[PDB]
C-alpha cells in the first residue's frame, strides 16, 4: 500500500522563528526562515516486521516513535519471551527523511542579535525540495523530541552519552528534567523543541517537438 | 452434535473368557457369559470445558483418557499458566456409563473349577440391556485399564491407595510392574484385562386399537 501524505498550505498567517513557545506543540503552523544547511536523505524505518528467535512467528506493522522499538508479546502460541528477535529488514517499510537547519531572515533580526535556529524535519517527497542559502516558507506541526540516549537505546554504541566537548555549566541542574518513569530509571528525561513540515515554498532542451508541446 | 456409535455383529467365531489372552488388545472380538452383577448407569465425562482463572479465556473439547485431565497451555501466550483451571459442567458433554460383571457358563466350566471373571463395560445407548442371571453375548474391543490412582489424581481423597484389606503376597513382586516415567516418578505402573462391549444380544396393554396396529 502507498503510504499517504497530506500537506496543507494557504494558512491565514504566519509565524517568525521568535514566536515558537511550547503552548503550540501539536498544532498546524506556518513558518519562514532561511535555509543555511541540509543533510543526506537518510532512510527512516516506518512499519517493522520481525520473527521469533524460537517459533520463528512473524510479526509486523510494529510502529516507532523516537527509538528502535522491537515487539514484547509473542504472537499466537505458547511461546513466553520477550526479546532476542531479528529485524526482516526486506519486509520492513520505509521512507526518506532529511534535516535542515534554518535561521531568521535579515529584517526580522533586531539592531544587535546573535540569530536564533530550528530543526526542520522534511520526510517523504518533501526531501532537496530546500536548498541552503534559499529563502523558503515551511508549513508542519510543532514537535517536541526527546533525548533517547538516556531512555535505553539497545546497543552499547551510545555509551551512556558519550561526548566530546564540555555541555554548559550555566545550565547545569537548570534544564528541569523528568524523573520517576522505569524506562528512564534513576535519569532524567529531557526534551527540546524542533519542526515537522509537510509542505515547502520559496519566497526568497533544444528538442523542437517537445517544445511545441507545451505552450498553448 | 450427536455423538455417534457404531455396533458390529454376527462375528463369524465367538470366544470363550479362557481364551482371553494380551495378543488380542486393541482387536474386535466377540465373547459370552452369564450376567452376575449389574451397577448404577453413571455420568462419564466425554468432551471437557475449562475456564483460564484469569484470562477468563474459554478453552473446549479436552478429551479424558483414564482420569481427570486438565489442559496445558493457555490459549493466549500473554498469560502464562499450567494449572489452576475451573470446569464448567454445564459446556461439557457427558454419556453414560455402566460396569457389568460376568463369568463362565455352566458347560464350559470343566469338572473342578473356580469360575473365571471379566469386567466388562456398556457406554451410550448399551446400558441396562444386560441383566444379572441372563446369559449374554457381548461384541465389542478387548482393552488394558491401568491404575490411575498411582498416575498423580488431583485431589488427595486417594490418599495414595488406601485400603482396607489385605492384598496378595504371593504376588508382591511377582506383578511386573513398568517404572521410568516421569509422571508415575518412582511409582510402578500397573495394568488388566477388561472388556469395552459395542453390541449386546441374549442368548438365554388392554387397548383395541394400538394393538391392531402392530399385526399384519
Ligand atoms: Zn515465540
Ligand atoms: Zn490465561
Not at 41 to 54: I, N
Not at 180 to 194: N, Q
Request: aromatic residues 8%; hydrophobic residues 35%.
Amino acid at each position: 500500500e502507498r503510504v499517504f501524505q497530506i500537506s496543507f498550505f494557504n494558512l491565514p498567517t504566519v509565524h517568525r522563528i521568535r514566536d515558537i513557545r511550547s503552548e503550540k506543540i501539536g498544532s498546524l503552523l506556518s513558518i519562514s526562515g532561511t535555509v543555511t544547511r541540509t543533510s543526506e536523505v537518510r532512510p527512516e524505518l516506518y512499519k517493522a516486521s520481525f520473527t521469533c528467535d524460537m517459533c520463528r512467528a512473524i510479526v509486523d506493522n510494529v510502529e516507532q516513535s523516537f527509538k528502535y522499538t522491537e515487539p514484547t508479546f509473542c504472537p499466537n502460541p505458547s511461546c513466553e519471551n520477550r526479546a532476542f528477535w531479528t529485524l526482516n529488514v526486506t519486509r520492513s517499510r520505509f521512507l526518506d527523511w532529511q534535516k535542515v537547519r534554518i535561521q531568521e531572515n535579515a529584517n526580522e533580526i533586531p539592531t544587535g542579535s546573535m540569530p536564533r535556529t530550528l530543526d526542520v524535519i522534511l520526510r517523504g517527497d518533501s526531501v532537496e525540495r530546500a536548498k541552503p542559502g534559499d529563502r523558503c516558507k515551511f508549513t508542519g506541526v510543532e514537535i517536541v523530541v526527546p533525548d533517547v540516549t538516556q531512555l535505553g537505546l539497545p546497543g552499547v554504541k551510545p555509551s551512556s552519552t558519550l561526548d566530546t566537548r564540555g555541555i554548559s555549566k550555566t545550565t547545569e541542574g537548570l534544564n528541569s528534567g523528568v524523573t520517576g518513569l522505569r524506562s528512564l530509571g534513576v535519569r532524567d528525561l529531557t526534551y527540546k523543541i524542533s519542526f515537522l513540515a509537510c509542505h515547502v515554498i520559496s519566497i526568497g532542451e533544444r528538442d523542437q517537438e517537445v517544445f511545441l508541446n507545451s505552450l498553448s
